[PDB]
Design a protein around this ligand. Structure first.
Ligand code: BCL
Ligand code: BCL
Ligand code: BCL
Ligand code: BCL
Ligand code: BPH
Ligand code: BPH
Ligand code: U10
Ligand code: U10
Ligand code: FE
Ligand code: MN
Lengths: 302, 238, 281
């Protein structure tokens, strides 16, 4: 056979193109990292450094005060036992604080009130992280294209982590931290609402988790095939299209009916995905305050 | 109820996007140029965006797209049928002429430039301290063709800098002259490499450098392209 | 009926069967030998999408849905009432994917680039096959298969899946699942990045294949580079499927009891099986 560019038959190396500068603060970039001589057969073999910032801290930091609460409740159930913490590690489950309390910041520790002090650290880690994808996008001078699409995910998250459960007043209509505990939380949700295939936000949100599968899984099938013609580096193609970008879109017009440019194709799938946490994000914000059941709406449509 | 609305007030952000998208996706390629090169019949129920201003790297100019998409060169294909669509047979030599599978491009006569400034595509014999860390170092491998014959040895490796990755191989032919090969189209082994695309004698026609230490995007197409083209017309010998 | 640069490619020769015959275009559409195959078959399909749609009564697609040879019959033929069609069609509907791809090859023959597509397809190709040719002929009778219906197949899964307790507990699913989520996050950054650095802050210079990487190294602390990611993509994707066309070719031919039960191969292991405390002792 031949060479299906999946593994660069060869690797090489030099120092480490530290990167750019622009207005970035480097008195805060640290030391490089080793060179996994494997992570190379694919992307770069280089590793490091990173920006340890005012936010670098806060983010990761409070990001721990979260997983050290899902490492504090499992080192309780397991009965401070090193064997149970392994066996019934999964099953471990810290569900929300019952409907009785409601919208109170006065939930006793042990029973559900340790779920609060857990979520709190979570928020301060994502909106302390999302908030950073900006600065990096800025000190470099790049459209918030990145920082934006993140909000996208936050969406679905915000709905199922504070949003929907405020119009419900029950801190207990949210999801718990534990392996299987939430897996059932979902199944036990496809149900207290009926059947959820009957939901054009899971009949669509779903739709998206498919193109972002076919599509993205087309860009590789694409991009790669023509590496031989400056396929790879996409940048200096927009600014100069070659047999590369050409032959490219060319296969698809002679196949599906049309195509996209180089710049385009991206703006293509970019939305394709964001729309999964967006349609979803919506999809669920309804079940519980605008539709007390969904097989209803399959017949009604009003 | 809000239920109904939300699912339609969204087939909006959906069709109203199918647009905003297929729009941007028409700066390079459209409007159509007939079987000659003149605007054609039915021209898609789609308009053409409001061309935007690119701000190229290091003031090395600017590009505004869409725009005057001129076919900056000739072609050697002269129709073998009468109605729209049909094939267009080559004039003489499809490869050199630069057509069909070997087709190449009208891109600037310059080498890519990293963000740092210097040329972006370099040769190992000149990389700033580049040892081959693992793999099968070909520097010294008697590269063979497809019709079974020797044609040249690997004398150096060309990499992309901040994208530290094997990109090309210089190979001295039958006369001590340097040629360049598309990493992404060869096969190293234990001791002998192999070019699946072309053969011994056809290495002759390979377009070449104009400075064996810096190579332009333009030139890249020519060769890469050529090489490709050979997967079809250099097969009666393999 | 042509892109500015489509001219310089339209060249003869490039068929796998026929020659210069079934070798020509159709406006902006190409044909090839399988250009006729992806038709003769496909259509013979809609020929039966109407015929079995009428003997059904209505014509509204929110209901139409030929069904598979009911759980009875077995592996034999079938009267053109129930199944008899669902089959003959399953065969022709498939036969157009064969061609759909084989046609996609003469299209990689003429351009001769990499074959990275007529392959990526063969993964969805099987994703199908298994869920109709394999999985079923291995459990018992076709029947098990899904209904070529629009709201009927959605109930084909809602069903069979629950047939084994919750379904998430299928390790060949959940793990075939992650390799599905992530892929999106993948696309998710590749476009929002490559783009974020193509239309950078209004004003300043277009960025570089450099900056890109630097971004994440400044964030995560790495960069699968460029040519890097563009595999991560493809693969990360192809996988999830391969991992799924599996969590099914399994559920029933080797595992019957509720999936969630399997999760005891673990909780009931020698060195901690009895032990008191937790949620199983
Ligand atoms: C994978 C496991 C299940 C399955 C589970 C689900 C689930 C769960 C859902 C769907 C949904 C859909 N499924 Mg399904 N589906 C299966 C197998 C199939 C097969 C097949 C030949 O085997 C087909 C054609 C479909 C097709 C479809 C779509 C009609 C619809 C999703 C839109 C979308 O974005 O899709 C992704 C594809 C793309 C982005 C690519 C573009 C392809 C387009 C969308 C196909 C349109 C087909 C058209 C409607 C049918 C034409 C047939 C006529 C006879 C010509 N499914 C298998 C058996 N399917 C969703 C829905 O809600 O539907 C109402 C949904 O929630
Ligand atoms: C019985 C169960 C029901 C069901 C119930 C539900 C329910 C309930 C929901 C879904 C939702 C979804 N379902 Mg479903 N679903 C079913 C069957 C299906 C089938 C199928 C073929 O049968 C399919 C394709 C789908 C598909 C989908 C998706 C479209 C959608 C979730 C998007 C996503 O990936 O979010 C993943 C992405 C995120 C969560 C992003 C947020 C990221 C956060 C902020 C990051 C945290 C980071 C962490 C702290 C950091 C860790 C790193 C450290 C280094 C360790 N479902 C069955 C029938 N489905 C969801 C939805 O949106 O629906 C509209 C939803 O709520
Ligand atoms: C969107 C619809 C449903 C849902 C549907 C599903 C389905 C369906 C599946 C999962 C699965 C998983 N879900 Mg979930 N899940 C939901 C909401 C959540 C929430 C939350 C705070 O709301 C959390 C923490 C999780 C967490 C998880 C993981 C434990 C597990 C996936 C691993 C993976 O793909 O890693 C990708 C990781 C990386 C690329 C980086 C390196 C990561 C290390 C190894 C992982 C640390 C993971 C961290 C603890 C979990 C993060 C996942 C969150 C979704 C962001 N889900 C909603 C309610 N979830 C899968 C599973 O295997 O279940 C048994 C699975 O099949
Ligand atoms: C009660 C229901 C169960 C359940 C039961 C099942 C079952 C049962 C199955 C899945 C399968 C899947 N489930 Mg599930 N699943 C559940 C809950 C979830 C949740 C969740 C958050 O709760 C998630 C994320 C998922 C996710 C997934 C996917 C990983 C996977 C389907 C993708 C696939 O294989 O496509 C495969 C793709 C194809 C078959 C399509 C190939 C495309 C063809 C070739 C092209 C047709 C073109 C057409 C003819 C042309 C139209 C022309 C127009 C012009 C466009 N499930 C619940 C718990 N799930 C499926 C799986 O893994 O299958 C192998 C599966 O069988
Ligand atoms: C369309 C939506 C898609 C999407 C998009 C998306 N995700 C995103 C973004 C976007 C646009 C980001 O910008 C953000 C990001 O920064 O990505 C690199 C992110 C992100 N998506 C993530 C996950 C994720 N996304 C998923 C999905 C999706 N993301 C969708 C497909 C999924 C799955 C499988 O469903 C997952 C798991 C996160 C990794 C990341 C956001 C990070 C975050 O919010 O962090 C808060 C901080 C913490 C929790 C810190 C604690 C970490 C560990 C407990 C510590 C241990 C490790 C550490 C390295 C030790 C150091 C020791 C020292 C001594 C050195
Ligand atoms: C890793 C695999 C991923 C993938 C890849 C993939 N798909 C591909 C390709 C690739 C590489 C193509 O080259 C090909 C393409 O051309 O894409 C633009 C394609 C393609 N992927 C498609 C769909 C598709 N892919 C999906 C998924 C995926 N594709 C995966 C995520 C899905 C899902 C999961 O929902 C769908 C619907 C097609 C649009 C397209 C191939 C089109 C084609 O072959 O067209 C000619 C075919 C006909 C004219 C068929 C007519 C047949 C008869 C009339 C009857 C129909 C029978 C059928 C059983 C009915 C089902 C009804 C449902 C309601 C149940
Ligand atoms: C950067 O790189 C890349 C490119 O290039 C620069 C590309 O272009 C593309 C692909 C191009 C796009 C524009 C992506 C678009 C997004 C999608 C989500 C596409 C999927 C959606 C569809 C609706 C596919 C359309 C599919 C079909 C099968 C249409 C068929 C229509 C008919 C009327 C049937 C005709 C059938 C045949 C067989 C023709 C023969 C006809 C006769 C008359 C005989 C990608 C992915 C890419 O990454
Ligand atoms: C140029 O921009 C960039 C891209 O392209 C535009 C990218 O695609 C990605 C990739 C990002 C992802 C989130 C997807 C995951 C990536 C892989 C390469 C997965 C490899 C697959 C396997 C089957 C190997 C399994 C083994 C391990 C060790 C998986 C661990 C997973 C990680 C995501 C760890 C890397 C990330 C961090 C933050 C370090 C944490 C370290 C631990 C030891 C834990 C990045 C970071 C990027 O910067
Ligand atoms: Fe890309
Ligand atoms: Mn300098």
């Amino acid at each position: 056979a031949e060479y299906q560019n999946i593994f660069s038959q060869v690797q090489v190396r030099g120092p480490a193109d530290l990167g750019m500068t622009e207005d970035v603060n480097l008195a805060n970039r640290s030391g490089v990292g080793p060179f996994s001589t494997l992570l190379g057969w694919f992307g770069n073999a280089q590793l490091g450094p990173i920006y340890l910032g005012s936010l670098g801290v806060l983010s990761l930091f409070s990001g721990l005060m979260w997983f050290f609460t899902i490492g504090i409740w499992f080192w309780y159930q397991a009965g401070w036992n090193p064997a149970v913490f392994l066996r019934d590690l999964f099953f471990f489950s810290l569900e929300p604080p019952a409907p009785e309390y409601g919208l109170s910041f006065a939930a006793p520790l042990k029973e559900g009130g340790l779920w609060l002090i857990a979520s709190f650290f979570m928020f301060v880690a994502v909106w302390s992280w999302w908030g950073r994808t900006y600065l990096r996008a800025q000190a470099l001078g790049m459209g918030k294209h990145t920082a934006w699409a993140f909000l996208s995910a936050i969406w679905l998250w915000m709905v199922l982590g504070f949003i929907r459960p405020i119009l419900m007043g029950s801190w207990s209509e949210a999801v718990p931290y534990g392996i299987f505990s939430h897996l059932d939380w979902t199944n036990n949700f496809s149900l207290v609402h009926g059947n959820l295939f009957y939901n054009p936000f899971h009949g669509l949100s779903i739709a998206f988790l498919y193109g972002s599968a076919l599509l993205f899984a087309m860009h590789g099938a694409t991009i790669l095939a023509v590496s031989r013609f400056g396929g790879e580096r996409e940048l200096e193609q927009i600014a100069d299209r070659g047999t590369a970008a050409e032959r490219a879109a060319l296969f698809w017009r002679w196949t599906m009916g049309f195509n996209a440019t180089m710049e385009g194709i991206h703006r293509w799938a970019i939305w394709m995905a964001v729309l999964v946490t967006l349609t979803g994000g919506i999809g669920i914000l309804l079940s519980g305050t605008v539709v007390d059941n969904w097989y209803v709406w399959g017949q009604n449509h009003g | 109820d809000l239920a109904s609305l939300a699912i339609y007030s969204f087939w909006i952000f959906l069709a109203g996007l199918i647009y905003y998208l297929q729009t941007e996706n028409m700066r390079e390629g459209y409007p159509l140029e007939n079987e000659d090169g003149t605007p054609a019949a039915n021209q898609g129920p789609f308009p053409l965006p409001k061309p935007k201003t690119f701000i190229l790297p290091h003031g090395r100019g600017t590009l505004t797209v869409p725009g005057p998409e001129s076919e900056d060169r000739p072609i050697a294909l002269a129709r073998t049928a009468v109605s729209e669509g049909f094939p267009h047979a080559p004039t003489g030599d499809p490869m050199k002429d630069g057509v069909g599978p070997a087709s190449w491009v009208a891109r600037r006569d310059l080498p890519e430039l990293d963000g740092h400034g210097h040329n972006k595509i370099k040769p190992m014999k000149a990389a700033a301290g580049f040892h081959v860390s693992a793999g099968k170092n070909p520097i010294g491998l008697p590269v063979r063709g497809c019709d079974l014959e020797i044609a040249g040895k690997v004398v150096d490796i060309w990499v992309d800098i901040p994208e530290q990755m094997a990109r090309f191989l210089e190979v001295e032919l039958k006369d001590g002259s340097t040629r360049l090969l598309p990493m992404q189209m060869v096969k190293v082994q234990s001791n002998r490499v192999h070019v699946n695309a072309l053969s011994s004698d056809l290495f002759a026609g390979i377009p070449t450098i104009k400075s064996p230490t810096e190579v332009t995007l333009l030139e890249e197409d020519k060769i890469c392209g050529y090489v490709a083209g050979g997967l079809m017309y250099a097969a009666p010998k393999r | 009926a042509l892109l500015s640069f489509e001219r310089k490619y339209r060249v003869p020769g490039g068929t796998l069967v026929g020659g210069n015959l079934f070798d020509f275009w159709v406006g902006p559409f190409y044909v090839g030998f399988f250009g006729v195959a992806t038709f003769f078959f496909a259509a013979l399909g809609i020929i039966l999408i109407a015929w079995s749609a009428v003997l059904q009564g209505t014509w509204n697609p929110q209901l139409i849905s030929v069904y598979p040879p009911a759980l009875e019959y077995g592996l034999g033929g079938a009267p053109l009432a129930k199944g008899g069609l669902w089959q003959i069609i399953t065969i022709c509907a498939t036969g157009a994917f064969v061609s759909w791809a084989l046609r996609e090859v003469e299209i990689c023959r003429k351009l001769g680039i990499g074959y990275h597509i007529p392959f990526a397809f063969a993964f969805a190709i099987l994703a199908y096959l298994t869920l109709v040719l394999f999985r079923p002929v291995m459990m018992g009778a076709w029947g098990y298969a899904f209904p070529y219906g629009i709201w009927t197949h959605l109930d084909w899964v809602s069903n069979t899946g629950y047939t084994y307790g919750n379904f998430h507990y299928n390790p060949a699913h959940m793990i075939a699942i992650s390799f599905f989520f992530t892929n999106a996050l993948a696309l998710a950054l590749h476009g929002a990045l490559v783009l974020s650095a193509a239309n950078p802050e209004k004003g300043k210079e277009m960025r570089t294949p450099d900056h890109e990487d630097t971004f994440f190294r400044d964030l995560v602390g790495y960069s699968i580079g460029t040519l890097g990611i563009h595999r991560l993509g493809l693969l990360l994707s192809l996988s999830a499927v391969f991992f799924s066309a599996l969590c099914m070719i399994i559920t029933g031919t080797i595992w019957f009891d509720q999936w969630v039960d399997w999760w005891q191969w673990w909780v009931k292991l020698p060195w901690w099986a009895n032990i008191p405390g937790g949620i199983n002792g």
